[PDB]
Design a protein around this ligand. Structure first.
Ligand SMILES: OC[C@H]1O[C@@](CO)(O[C@H]2O[C@H](CO)[C@@H](O)[C@H](O)[C@H]2O)[C@@H](O)[C@@H]1O
Ligand SMILES: Cc1nc(Cc2cc(F)c(O)c(F)c2)c(O)n1C
Ligand SMILES: [K+]
Ligand SMILES: [Mg+2]
Lengths: 225, 215
RNA sequence: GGACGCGACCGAAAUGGUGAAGGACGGGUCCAGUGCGAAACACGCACUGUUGAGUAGAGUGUGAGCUCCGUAACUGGUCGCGUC
């Protein structure tokens, strides 16, 4: 019954502003403390801000003090995080959390939203170039052959990858994106397949990058040699 | 002064059914205002324990917490498959709140050698001025692995990046990509591109290579 | 000896004024901690604490007691005097 949905995330340039929303359902925020907590990719949870019930008192981590303002609108049963003068290092998934009822959960945060990704960068939005990783003319490694797709130079996160429109799932490994020195992301998605069917089977990677209105389908074939 | 929560170990490999303990050490008194959370990849944290030792409603009793002064422990009495995840302590005694840096709990299994594959850059990419060469290490265990690049036998350094999957849901193996980036010009100056893989499961290090012109 | 009456001295419930005492005379208020109220602070309640707090009060009590100066009911004691 109890749920939190955060929204408003996206790409902003350093110095820019962004307002996040945390829409509650199944409870009324007025009876609870509400918190924002963030997690930069590959890093730990970092407490950002909170607002206390009844008094409206607000608290902030030093890292965001003076730039961020947390608020609560009871009419929309929604909390907000207003972020000004954003910096590269503010990049993270932003979660809002309910601090639970004292008698039942002490000061534990008992419910969390799914999170919303905030990207702060000077880099411009850009869809990926997709390149084949061709199955080798050679025989085998580990019993099979391997092929895939290189999804290079997109921004910002995320991109999704599937194979044969979701029909091919076994043996698929899609790697976590890596931020390149260019400040663009890149990743590969690979799959292992029988080596004997490389000519008569079709393998297509479906790459979707919503922020740039880019969706590409690349057929991956053995190279001409 | 801000309160520190020093968490250890930062990672741990265990078998299903094992008893594990994760510790967080506060740098000042936090009374008993310590909570523990579980986080799976791509998901929000979930509350397990509050006030140091109280089990959050609906959380299985194999999870327990204890306080010894300013040291706090989360114990899983007997790990089940779904318990593999990252765990975080949090002090909320005073503002600002502090989180421990986390403990990743991963599943042990038998050693598995990587299957190795190398991929030359496509012609399409080349005609755009950059060459990406990819080395794939597939379905191995444990995580620890060494991948180095050689071009015409010269050891590369600083021009490759690695990425690794989360432990696989079925076989508990890892897969890893290493990507060597070169300008088109540098790439065309050389012939032999090799990646060399060292791993506990291999009888001896494995080299996968191609010659630039030939495929 | 006794009783009644008058008066004086003493005592005295009660009352006005006075000036010292701080937590072992209290209450109030504040402060701290803990728990609770859908509640970390602010607000309210409960519990705990004076090796927590001014006897210049920082009180819409400086309230009770006392120190010290008066008024004083009397069912009080004593002495004198008048009378029986
Ligand atoms: O606000 C910084 C503060 O948060 C902690 C956790 O309480 O660290 C978090 O934020 C850091 C980013 O500055 C991350 O590097 C770290 O992984 C994350 O847990 C504290 O350690 C830090 O003082
Ligand atoms: C300074 C001040 N103290 C109090 C009361 C008080 C002080 C103590 F020290 C105690 O022990 C005690 F029981 C009561 C006030 O009302 N004010 C204004
Ligand atoms: K007093
Ligand atoms: Mg209070």
């Amino acid at each position: 019954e109890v749920q939190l949905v955060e929204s408003g995330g996206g790409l902003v340039q350093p110095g820019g502003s962004l307002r996040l929303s945390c829409a509650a359902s199944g409870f009324y925020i007025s009876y609870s403390s509400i918190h924002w907590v963030r997690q930069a990719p590959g890093k730990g949870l970092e407490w950002v801000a909170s607002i206390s019930p009844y008094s409206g008192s607000t608290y902030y981590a030093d890292s965001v003090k003076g730039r961020f303002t947390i608020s609560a609108d009871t009419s929309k049963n929604t909390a907000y995080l207003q972020m000004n003068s954003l910096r590269a290092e503010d990049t993270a998934v932003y979660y809002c959390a309910r601090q639970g009822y004292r008698r039942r959960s002490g000061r534990g945060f008992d419910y969390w939203g799914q999170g919303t990704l905030v990207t702060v960068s000077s880099a411009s939005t850009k869809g990926p170039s997709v390149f084949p990783l061709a199955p080798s003319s050679k025989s085998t490694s580990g019993g099979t052959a391997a092929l895939g797709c290189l999804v290079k130079d997109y921004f910002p996160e995320p991109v999704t990858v599937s194979w044969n429109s979701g029909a091919l799932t076994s043996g698929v490994h899609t790697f976590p994106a890596v931020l390149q020195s260019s400040g663009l992301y890149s990743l590969s998605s690979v799959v292992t397949v029988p080596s004997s069917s490389l000519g008569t089977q079709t393998y297509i990677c479906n790459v979707n990058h919503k922020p740039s209105n880019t969706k590409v389908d690349k057929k991956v074939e053995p190279k001409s040699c | 002064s801000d309160i520190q929560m020093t968490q250890s170990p930062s990672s741990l490999s265990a078998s299903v059914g094992d008893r594990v303990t994760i510790t967080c050490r506060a740098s000042q008194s936090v009374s008993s205002a310590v909570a523990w959370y579980q986080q799976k990849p791509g998901k929000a944290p979930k509350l397990l324990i509050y006030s140091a030792s109280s089990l959050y409603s609906g959380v299985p009793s194999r999870f327990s917490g204890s306080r010894s002064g300013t040291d706090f422990t989360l114990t899983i009495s007997s790990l089940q498959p779904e318990d593999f995840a990252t765990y975080y302590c949090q002090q909320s005694y005073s503002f600002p709140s502090t989180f421990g840096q986390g403990t990743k709990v991963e599943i042990k299994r038998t050693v598995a050698a990587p299957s190795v594959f190398i991929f030359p850059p496509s012609d399409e990419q080349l005609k755009s001025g950059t060459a990406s060469v990819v080395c794939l290490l597939n379905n191995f265990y444990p995580r620890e692995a060494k991948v180095q690049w050689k071009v015409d036998n010269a050891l590369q350094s600083g021009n490759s990046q690695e990425s690794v999957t989360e432990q696989d849901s079925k076989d508990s193996t890892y897969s890893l990509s290493s990507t060597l980036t070169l300008s088109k010009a540098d790439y065309e100056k050389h012939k032999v591109y090799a990646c060399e893989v060292t791993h506990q499961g291999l009888s001896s290090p494995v080299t996968k290579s191609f010659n630039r012109g030939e495929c």
